């Protein structure tokens, strides 16, 4: 194929010429996201029981759908949490590669089914079916700095005004409004009610009577009476629209003939659905939208069109109303891109020096200048047809990538040289002699590098979907860069390379070229003379072999493994949790606080505090909050002492002194769509009826047992919220029917006062909106209020609820969690310094095992995730083993000689191990793939050494030590271009210390340092593994 | 107090040796919640008998009520923890006492039909004639509950 | 049954329309709400 | 037809227009099949 090609360079050029068309073509339509979608897809239940209480919403609602999520396919697991909020979310969890579409449909029409079984309220309220997702492209913040408007004003402008424009622009996926629309609110009053012998009953009552749409039909209708000369519709009574014509809604009319109106018994105007988030922007009431990217969408085009949109809307906006962006990754996933394209850049500028410095002519130094950039945008038309994206992974795959596609390069271009100097060949004659002597090498290397990358994209769930990023962008460059050296390259050898006469090395020359030629040809004697010495004593390297590998393994056990490193994504949370039963009010006191220290002592980093009352991850209620801070630009945070990780850790330090609350500020993970993914992640399962409580009892003692091993297991926790006193109201049946008063009446008027009560809709403005009845607050806030309550009796008389109830206090849980259909309680933990996951896990299960009758558990998340990829790895590493060594028996025609290739492993990853573990980095996912690449390049390195040493002999008779030799001294130039310009290349990622330096610094610093060592070692290692290997296997 | 709030969490979660130390270092034991409630209304709740029998021994208030009425010995009797009412009454718990609604802790014993403590009850004087706001007595309970070994023991 | 076109169009249609966003190869939606009370909503899709 | 207009009305117009394809297009024209109550425009009585 390279003779066919260096004859016919036309005929290769075209071959670029396609490739660089379909790359340029893949630029311009490929995706353009932060990340790709990694977790299996999960579908979530949303539903709202407005005044419910946790086991209310579990025992009415949550377990009927469970009971109904059969016949659906390909689901995993199923959980699902119940608290007093009213609310409940079911997660169904499915296969890695299920349908998220059919996942979604199916869960959805098992609902649709169940409906009837739930209760009118919440069949009122609905239940939302949605695909889970964790990534928002951005959170665009809305608030008012003229103290004009309050949240709940916000929000209602925002839905109204903005959010549906924003869901119409282009690339977004879909839009979370974080408030809602207005609603009439009707506060109730139960003095006022009483004096008017009138309930909340009456109200509801009223309000649907005389807030309705109401049919009617038409005058002249079909089948008319001939003669008719019009037909029209009759229009009846329709829904009101106005705080005024709802106080008008008529409640009584008297004896003496006054009239009771709505106004006289509730206050009226418009608010919110819900009270229980306050929200603040800097301390100012807000609300915003939190943008999803949609499928197959462009980041960065998506993010300027709501900008453009936004703007639009500027003139419109209310006084005091200000878009604000406290998140927005595309300012991360463009500074990605930019970083990415200058290390590509400047890769093919030190290939352009280092091609210059070596072989001093700059017809050399422009062929590969021409086949890298060629490989590269081939190798973005083979993602695009995978239907890949343009991402942080498969962009650092093409960095992780370079050293393998400059050696493509450099390797054939480099041969052709030596050849023509060596033998005064003409280039074109000279080019079809080189590649005779590398073309099966350039063959059995692509095979080798498949076997090794391929098998890494067969690892399930969501660490097999990081790897296969890696894995498809890796083999596609490679591909490609072989094919580039076989067809390309080879071309433009013979047609633009001069020739170099016999003899010619370049020593005669004056100034730098004439002595570096002299110092280079002296040092290539000084080398081969060394491997001489080393080939006479090769025991003595051996056992430096095993060192070398002994110390590898021994750096590899110690080395702390993650995930993906943390970055400085100009934002981080701040923790607040109060004791259990603590008021929102008290919540506030806590969250100024912290709004406070970070914009007094933080003010030169921190540009707002967006604080929210009332959410908390590990639970909802009053007593919890989060402050999501958004910093300044990285360029006016110079340092690490002003960067998040420092930002946070003097926060929670200075956070520590807050009384009765616990307080602390931590990073994001660099995954949002996945969770820590750091851990553990086990659930406790009551398998036998036996309760709450004493499932709760069965948790505690796993909990302290799991306290008396600090060695093993770390923070193991419960990831729930713990029971709390709540107030149990017995109605007494036999009094209330003694009075004549009924229990509709009674849990009527109760559960509405107090819980409130959604009764129909209005129309705002052209929006259909709810309307709430409840209590005023200052009449339902403790328990002597219950007592102004009335209802009215049979017999008209009005019975006070004191009347014919007891309360007391109990405990009850505030939020009840469930796991495949089943009560359970969710723990996390970690393992101890220096322990595996793996090892922690054992030993938790060793603890469950030891609890009470009936108390199983199950691993979910992240812990079902390892599980199942690390059953896979054993065989995929012997696949890729196995295979490796079947592609260099068949290169080499020995079953011996691969092991002299094979041996180079440790070489490279003791390099990468020592500058990871001094640098004091992790076991990640770039540190593993770059791992990969650099024994695959060190591999290649060898490959040629050996495929030289071997053809030597067996072409020319030489000698084992005289071809090694010869090998060797032909192979030094050649290994130290391409080292000197792949390490000079990703200098510059180790030292970065700007945004994205978290991700920049595990490819390079792997990288660097298994690149030094496996440069050193291997150009006096090889020729050791070569007669070694050659004199045990003769 | 910082260390009343842990006595609580304490005391409730049954952390015998935590409420060792905390009665050490003088830890107030009649420290009390939102809704009233000591270490040993919670260690009465929840069944810590040993704890019970630290806190009494420093000076907690075996007759203390919550915001409702109620007393530990409500909430013993009405839990069914045997040993805990009988410690409470030796130690001088009000074996009358009425909550807001008129309850006592017999009434509770008889509703859920804990046997042995309505008789530990009666035994040290429980007034089986006592009503409730509603005028129920311990006896109308078991008949309305259908126990019919409790309506014998209440005669 | 029985609603305007102007009722059924802001208590229907836009509750509808407003959820269409984020599907896949929706080229245009065209909607019409009229006296008898009914809705269409028709969604068309890219070819292919 | 305009707003408000009878089914009666919309028969008269249907009747021209069948007229028209049965009488002035007898050549040409095989069938009408005509509806009143039905069109491009909704089931009204003023449109066929
Ligand atoms: C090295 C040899 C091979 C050459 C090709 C190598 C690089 C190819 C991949 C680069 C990524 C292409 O991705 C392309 O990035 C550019 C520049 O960020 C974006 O271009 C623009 O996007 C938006 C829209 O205004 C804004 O942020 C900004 O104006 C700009 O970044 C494109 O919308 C995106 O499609
Ligand atoms: C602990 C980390 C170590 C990392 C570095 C290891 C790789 C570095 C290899 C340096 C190789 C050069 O070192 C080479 O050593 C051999 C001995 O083996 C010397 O060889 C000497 O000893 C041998 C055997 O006794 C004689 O046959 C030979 O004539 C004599 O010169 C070479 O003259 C020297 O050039
Ligand atoms: C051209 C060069 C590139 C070609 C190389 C690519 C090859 C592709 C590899 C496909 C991987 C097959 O995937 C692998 O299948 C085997 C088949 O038993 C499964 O098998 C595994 O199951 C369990 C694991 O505890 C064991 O009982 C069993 O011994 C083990 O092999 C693995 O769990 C799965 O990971
Ligand atoms: C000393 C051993 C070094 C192993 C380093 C592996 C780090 C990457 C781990 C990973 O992501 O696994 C993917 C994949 C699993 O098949 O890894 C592998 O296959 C690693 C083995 C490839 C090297 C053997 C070939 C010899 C060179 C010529
Ligand atoms: C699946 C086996 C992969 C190994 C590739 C071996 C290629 C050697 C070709 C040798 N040659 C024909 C050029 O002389
Ligand atoms: C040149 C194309 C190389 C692409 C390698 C494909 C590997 C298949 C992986 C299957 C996905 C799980
Ligand atoms: C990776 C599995 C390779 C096993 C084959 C070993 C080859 C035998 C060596 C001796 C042949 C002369
Ligand atoms: C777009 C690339 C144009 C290639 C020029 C062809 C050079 C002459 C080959 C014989
Ligand atoms: C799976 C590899 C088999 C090779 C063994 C050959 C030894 C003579
Ligand atoms: C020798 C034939 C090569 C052609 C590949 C396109
Ligand atoms: C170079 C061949 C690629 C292998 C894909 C399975
Ligand atoms: C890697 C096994 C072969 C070593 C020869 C001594």
Redo the contacts between chains.
């Keep these: 194929m390279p003779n066919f090609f260096i004859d016919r360079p036309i005929f290769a050029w075209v071959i670029a010429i396609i490739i660089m068309l379909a790359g340029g073509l893949a630029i311009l339509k490929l995706p353009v996201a932060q990340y790709p979608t990694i977790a299996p897809p999960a579908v979530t239940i949303s539903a709202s029981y407005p005044g419910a209480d946790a086991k209310t919403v579990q025992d009415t609602v949550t377990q009927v759908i469970e009971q109904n999520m059969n016949g659906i396919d390909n689901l995993m697991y199923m959980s699902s949490n119940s608290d007093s909020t009213g609310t409940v979310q079911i997660t169904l969890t499915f296969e890695s590669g299920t349908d998220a579409d059919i996942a979604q449909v199916q869960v959805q029409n098992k609902l649709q089914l169940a409906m009837p079984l739930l209760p009118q309220e919440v069949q009122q309220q609905g239940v939302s079916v949605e695909k889970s997702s964790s990534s928002f492209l951005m959170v665009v913040g809305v608030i008012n700095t003229d103290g004009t408007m309050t949240q709940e004003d916000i929000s209602d402008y925002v839905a109204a005004n903005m959010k549906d424009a924003i869901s119409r622009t282009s690339g977004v996926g879909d839009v979370q409004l974080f408030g809602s629309q207005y609603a009439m609110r009707i506060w109730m009053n139960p003095n006022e009610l009483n004096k008017f012998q009138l309930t909340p009953v009456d109200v509801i009552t009223a309000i649907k009577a005389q807030n309705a749409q109401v049919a009617a039909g038409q005058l002249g209708g079909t089948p008319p009476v001939k003669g008719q000369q019009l037909n029209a519709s009759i229009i009846a009574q329709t829904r009101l629209t106005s705080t005024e014509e709802f106080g008008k809604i008529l409640l009584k009319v008297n004896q003496d003939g006054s009239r009771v109106l709505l106004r006289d018994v509730a206050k009226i105007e418009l608010g919110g659905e819900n009270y229980d988030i306050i929200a603040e922007f800097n301390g100012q009431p807000a609300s915003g939208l939190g943008i999803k990217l949609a499928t197959g969408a462009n980041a960065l085009d998506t993010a300027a069109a709501i900008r453009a949109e936004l703007a639009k809307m500027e003139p419109f906006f209310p006084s005091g109303l200000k878009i604000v962006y406290p998140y927005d990754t595309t300012p991360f996933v463009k500074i990605s891109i930019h970083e990415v394209v200058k290390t590509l850049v400047e890769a093919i500028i030190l290939v352009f020096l280092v091609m210059y410095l070596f072989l001093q002519n700059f017809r050399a130094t422009l062929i590969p200048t021409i086949a890298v950039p060629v490989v590269l945008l081939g190798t973005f038309a083979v993602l695009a047809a995978f239907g890949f994206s343009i991402n942080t992974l498969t962009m650092f795959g093409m960095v992780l990538a370079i050293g393998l596609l400059v050696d493509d390069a450099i390797v054939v271009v480099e041969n052709v040289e030596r050849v023509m100097a060596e033998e005064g060949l003409p280039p074109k004659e000279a080019t079809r002699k080189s590649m005779g002597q590398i073309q099966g090498a350039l063959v059995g290397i692509a095979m080798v590098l498949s076997a090794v990358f391929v098998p890494m994209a067969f690892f399930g769930g969501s660490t097999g979907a990081i790897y296969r990023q890696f894995s498809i962008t890796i083999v596609s460059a490679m591909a490609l860069s072989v094919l580039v050296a076989l067809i390309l390259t080879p071309a433009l050898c013979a047609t633009m390379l001069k020739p170099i006469a016999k003899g010619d090395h370049g020593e005669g020359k004056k100034g730098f070229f004439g002595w570096f030629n002299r110092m280079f040809e002296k040092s290539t004697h000084h080398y081969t003379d060394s491997v001489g010495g080393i080939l006479r004593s090769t025991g003595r390297y051996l056992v430096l072999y095993l060192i070398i590998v002994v110390g590898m393994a021994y750096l590899f056990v110690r080395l702390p493994s993650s995930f993906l490193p943390d970055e400085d994504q100009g934002v981080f949370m701040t923790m607040v949790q109060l004791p259990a039963g603590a008021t929102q009010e008290r919540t506030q006191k806590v969250l100024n606080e912290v709004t406070h220290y970070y914009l007094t002592k933080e003010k030169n980093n921190v540009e707002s505090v967006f604080a929210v009352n009332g959410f908390g991850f590990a639970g909802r209620g009053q007593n919890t909050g989060i402050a999501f801070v958004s910093l300044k630009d990285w360029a006016d945070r110079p340092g690490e002492e002003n960067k998040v990780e420092a930002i946070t850790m003097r926060a929670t330090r200075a956070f520590s002194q807050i009384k009765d609350a616990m307080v602390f500020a931590f990073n994001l993970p660099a995954i949002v769509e996945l969770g820590t993914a750091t851990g553990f992640d086990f659930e406790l399962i009551d398998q036998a009826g036996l309760g709450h409580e004493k499932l709760t009892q069965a948790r505690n003692q796993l909990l302290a047992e799991a306290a008396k091993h600090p060695d093993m297991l770390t923070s193991v926790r419960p990831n729930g919220l713990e029971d709390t006193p709540q107030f149990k109201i017995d109605i007494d049946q036999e009094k209330a029917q003694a009075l004549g008063v009924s229990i509709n009446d009674i849990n009527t008027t109760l559960g509405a006062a107090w819980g409130g009560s959604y009764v129909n809709d209005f129309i705002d403005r052209g929006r259909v909106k709810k309307v709430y009845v409840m209590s005023e607050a200052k009449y339902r806030m403790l328990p002597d209020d219950i007592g102004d309550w009335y209802v009215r009796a049979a017999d008209g008389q009005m019975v006070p609820f004191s009347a014919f109830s007891s309360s007391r206090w109990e405990y009850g849980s505030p939020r009840l969690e469930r796991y495949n259909g089943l009560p359970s309680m969710e723990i996390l933990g970690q393992a101890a310094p220096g322990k595996s996951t793996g090892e922690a896990m054992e030993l938790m299960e060793q603890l469950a095992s030891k609890l009470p009758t009936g108390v199983g558990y199950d691993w979910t998340g992240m812990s079902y995730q390892e599980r199942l990829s690390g059953n896979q790895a054993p065989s995929l590493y012997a696949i890729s083993l196995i295979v490796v060594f079947l592609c260099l028996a068949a290169l080499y025609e020995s079953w011996s000689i691969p092991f002299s290739v094979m041996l180079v492993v440790p070489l490279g990853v003791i390099g990468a191990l020592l500058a990871a573990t001094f640098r004091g980095l992790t076991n990640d996912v770039y540190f593993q793939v770059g791992l990969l690449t650099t024994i695959g390049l060190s591999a290649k390195n060898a490959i040629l050494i050996v495929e030289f040493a071997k053809d030597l002999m067996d072409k020319e008779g030489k000698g084992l030590i005289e071809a090694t030799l010869d090998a060797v001294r032909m192979r030094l130039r050649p290994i130290l271009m391409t080292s000197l310009a792949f390490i000079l290349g990703v200098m510059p990622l180790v030292i970065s210390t700007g945004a994205g330096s978290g991700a920049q610094n595990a490819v390079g610093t792997g990288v660097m340092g298994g690149m030094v060592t496996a440069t050193v070692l291997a150009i006096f290692f090889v020729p050791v593994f070569f007669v070694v290997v050659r004199r045990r296997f003769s | 107090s ?1 260390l009343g ?1 842990k006595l609580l969490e304490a005391a409730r ?1 049954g952390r015998d040796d935590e409420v060792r130390i905390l009665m050490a270092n003088g830890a107030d034991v009649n420290a009390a ?5 000591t270490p040993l209304h919670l260690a009465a ?1 929840w069944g810590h008998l040993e704890i019970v029998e630290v806190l009494l021994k420093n000076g907690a208030d075996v007759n203390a009520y ?3 009425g ?1 007393t530990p010995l409500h909430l013993a009797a009405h839990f069914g923890h045997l040993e805990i009412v009988e410690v409470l009454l030796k130690n001088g718990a009000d074996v009358n006492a009425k ?3 008129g ?1 006592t802790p017999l009434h509770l014993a008889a509703n859920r039909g804990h046997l042995e403590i309505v008789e530990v009850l009666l035994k040290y004087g429980a007034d089986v004639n006592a009503q ?3 005028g129920k007595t311990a006896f109308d309970i078991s008949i309305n509950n259908g126990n019919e070994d409790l309506a014998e023991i209440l005669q």
């Design positions: 910082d709030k979660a919640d939102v809704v009233g409630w709740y919550d915001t409702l109620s909550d807001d609604n309850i409730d706001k509603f």
